[PDB]
Amino acid sequence: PVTWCVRIXPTVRCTVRX
C-alpha cells in the first residue's frame, strides 16, 4: 500500500510496495 517515487537520473519511477 506504499508508493515509493524515486528517480533514476531524469527518469522518475513509482515503485509500489504493497
Amino acid at position 2, single letter: V
Q: How far is residue 18's CA from residue 11's CA, in Å, rounded to a whole number? A: 22
Give the separation between CA 18 and CA 10, rounded to whole angstroms.
Answer: 25
- CB distance 12 to 5 below 8 Å: yes
Experimental technique, in short, is: NMR
Rounded Cα distance between 11 and 9, Å, is 6
d(CA 1, CA 9): 25
d(CA 9, CA 18): 25
d(CA 8, CA 14): 11
Of 18, 12, 11, nearest in space to 3 by CA: 18
